[PDB]
Amino acid sequence: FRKMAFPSGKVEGCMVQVTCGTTTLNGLWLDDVVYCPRHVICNPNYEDLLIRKSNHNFLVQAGNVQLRVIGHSMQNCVLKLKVDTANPKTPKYKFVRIQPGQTFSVLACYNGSPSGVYQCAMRPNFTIKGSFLNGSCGSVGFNIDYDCVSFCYMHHMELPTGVHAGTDLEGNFYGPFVDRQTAQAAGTDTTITVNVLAWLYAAVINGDRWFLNRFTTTLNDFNLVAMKYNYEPLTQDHVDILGPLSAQTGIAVLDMCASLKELLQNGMNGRTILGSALLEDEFTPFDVVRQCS
Amino acid sequence: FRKMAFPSGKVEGCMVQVTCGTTTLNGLWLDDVVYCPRHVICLNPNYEDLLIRKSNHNFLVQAGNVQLRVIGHSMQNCVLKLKVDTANPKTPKYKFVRIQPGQTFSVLACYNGSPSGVYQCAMRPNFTIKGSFLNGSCGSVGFNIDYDCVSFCYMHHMELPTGVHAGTDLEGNFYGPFVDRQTAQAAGTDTTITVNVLAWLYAAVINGDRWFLNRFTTTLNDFNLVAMKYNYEPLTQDHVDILGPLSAQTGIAVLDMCASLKELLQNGMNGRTILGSALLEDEFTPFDVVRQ
Ligand SMILES: *[C@H](O)[C@H](C[C@@H]1CCNC1=O)NC(=O)[C@H](CC(C)C)NC(=O)OC1CC2(CCN(C#N)CC2)C1
């Protein structure tokens, strides 16, 4: 199994740079709106900072071509700059707010120019482990379903521990973070249980099934046990997204939970699963199906 | 640290679907030529004979919801070249390159001429690649980007019984001793790309991971004796030179990192992990580590 990003071309066609004074970050140009982190305008009072701004103070560029700003507004932590040109490369798109544990592709950009693409999992504490250098703010995270781009992340900051935090495309942070340059702590991270379960299903699909036990369990039982091992509690949505893999294998989700509970309490007893002594938690049920099928 | 592919947009604009008979795979449309694996034309295939028997009209080439008219065809090594009557307006600046083993490249995996995923691969010393390629992936390409120029280095042809993959450059020459016939083929013994493992250990130190460092040291030759024993590639002096920037940046001499790797090979990691991995990783070049 490989971490595999979506092809980035449809998002590349939407990347621009936004500059206030000397401060440049990336923006997302969809139809006639450019979306970018509000801290391009800088414990700040963003509303009073924004009131002082006029359209003509914002430099928006696609490459070296200026896009004239004709309106500006703030939605939570994102600035929306209305521009006078509809992006001819606008894909079919939606804005979605993902759940922790879900994965997405990031197009890392600097000065509006893409540098690389890679897959991220959002940790249960709402941080991501990116590759985000200075000037990466406004880089976006996305999934692609058919020809529809689902934008789910916009990058804003790095935490003291080196992980990253940002918002959805409506400007609402993932996690208990603010776009102030203050010291901020993420919750203690946990292992993404639903993704480990997906991984075990993937092992079964490939014929590696020694760890399957003859018992089952309750979701509450598992969640109480799993908390002792630094595993995220399962939600009903988690059970639901395992449905296709459960159907593919005939193994009930709660039967797989019992198998995982046994692995956690007893360990691997010297064995490997998919050729690894470590359980993997960065592949979602969707990722497993994409790469097997 | 993180495996990072090049942005794939310039390659996406070149992918088309090619069908002959009941066989469908991907092609690369640059200017007015579509490049694809010649096994689209079909256990011992005489491709020259099968090719003489094909008509231009036998080849169904689609760029999305548009058929492209094949006005000509030829074969260079294991690559079929279909001349079409329309030039691809999205053709980027490009070159065809043959990569060296241990170098890396991005793969745009495609099915039915539609891009599905992008990821980073290395050309293994035994000239296989560890890809994620399913039925219908043939003709997917590998590439690097330098400035705005796309350097195409790989086109996908086959899977080996061990689950690794083999293909050609865009001139149609296989990497490795493989043949485009439907036989189970084994690769040579693979070996580990030492200079990349060292680059990755330096990446681990930059990210604050340093439990594996030691005060021990070693000569280049004594390192290489132990490396070869564990089926690692010998480290050349040019590879030492290539590691210079990461050495400067960390203040850890290349041969000091070699001494740490020797200890890792001899003992193991004893449950410990490096950058999250129970295994020593060898598909990051020095350049890949520096650029990031
Ligand atoms: C072209 O799309 C296809 C891609 C292969 C098919 C599935 N994954 C791939 O990479 N290439 C071929 O079908 C190729 C044509 C000949 C070289 C003319 N033949 C091929 O790759 O055969 C493979 C199947 C194989 C046996 C089953 N194994 C297991 N488990 C792995 C490899 C030999």
Side-chain angles (χ1 to χ4, degrees), chain A residues 2 5 7-9 12 116-117 131, chain B residues 5 8-9 12 118 120 130 132 292:
Chain A
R2 286 205 148 268
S8 58
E12 291 171 58
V117 68
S131 182
Chain B
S8 54
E12 291 172 51
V118 66
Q120 203 65 2
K130 304 177 183 276
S132 320
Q292 176 178 353

Side-chain angles (χ1 to χ4, degrees), chain B residues 125-145 149-206 208-214 217-261:
Chain B
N126 71 353
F127 290 111
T128 63
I129 74 179
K130 304 177 183 276
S132 320
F133 289 122
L134 306 178
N135 288 0
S137 57
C138 285
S140 298
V141 298
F143 62 93
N144 287 286
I145 303 183
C149 184
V150 177
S151 293
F152 293 105
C153 61
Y154 176 90
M155 180 173 268
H156 186 49
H157 292 246
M158 66 199 300
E159 181 162 321
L160 303 187
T162 57
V164 298
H165 297 98
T168 63
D169 61 20
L170 270 297
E171 292 197 318
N173 284 317
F174 267 89
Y175 294 95
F178 308 115
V179 184
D180 49 339
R181 77 186 6 200
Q182 188 66 49
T183 59
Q185 296 167 55
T189 294
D190 203 18
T191 64
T192 300
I193 304 149
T194 307
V195 64
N196 295 359
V197 175
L198 293 171
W200 181 77
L201 296 182
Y202 279 110
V205 169
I206 299 171
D209 227 354
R210 57 221 317 297
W211 63 263
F212 53 81
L213 299 186
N214 65 31
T217 192
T218 183
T219 69
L220 184 56
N221 184 73
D222 289 343
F223 170 75
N224 280 337
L225 287 176
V226 182
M228 291 187 294
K229 179 181 184 192
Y230 293 89
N231 250 318
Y232 273 55
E233 293 182 336
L235 192 68
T236 66
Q237 182 55 57
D238 293 340
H239 289 164
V240 171
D241 299 338
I242 285 155
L243 287 163
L246 297 167
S247 185
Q249 175 170 345
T250 54
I252 303 170
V254 178
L255 294 176
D256 289 352
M257 194 64 76
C258 285
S260 301
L261 176 54

Side-chain angles (χ1 to χ4, degrees), chain A residues 278, chain B residues 200 204 209 211-212 269-271 273-279:
Chain A
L278 295 183
Chain B
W200 181 77
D209 227 354
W211 63 263
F212 53 81
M269 298 175 54
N270 311 335
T273 69
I274 302 175
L275 293 166
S277 178
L279 304 174

Side-chain angles (χ1 to χ4, degrees), chain B residues 62-64 66 68 70-89 91-92 94 96-135:
Chain B
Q62 313 210 279
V66 159
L68 308 180
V70 176
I71 71 184
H73 64 269
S74 54
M75 167 173 83
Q76 176 184 11
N77 306 304
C78 302
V79 158
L80 181 68
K81 299 189 251 206
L82 304 177
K83 180 127 102 84
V84 295
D85 61 357
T86 307
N88 185 358
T91 302
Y94 74 92
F96 287 173
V97 302
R98 195 178 173 81
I99 52 166
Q100 298 307 298
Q103 289 191 285
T104 60
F105 59 94
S106 300
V107 169
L108 182 69
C110 299
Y111 301 86
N112 297 108
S114 303
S116 64
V118 66
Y119 53 86
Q120 203 65 2
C121 282
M123 185 51 67
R124 310 290 307 152
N126 71 353
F127 290 111
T128 63
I129 74 179
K130 304 177 183 276
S132 320
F133 289 122
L134 306 178
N135 288 0

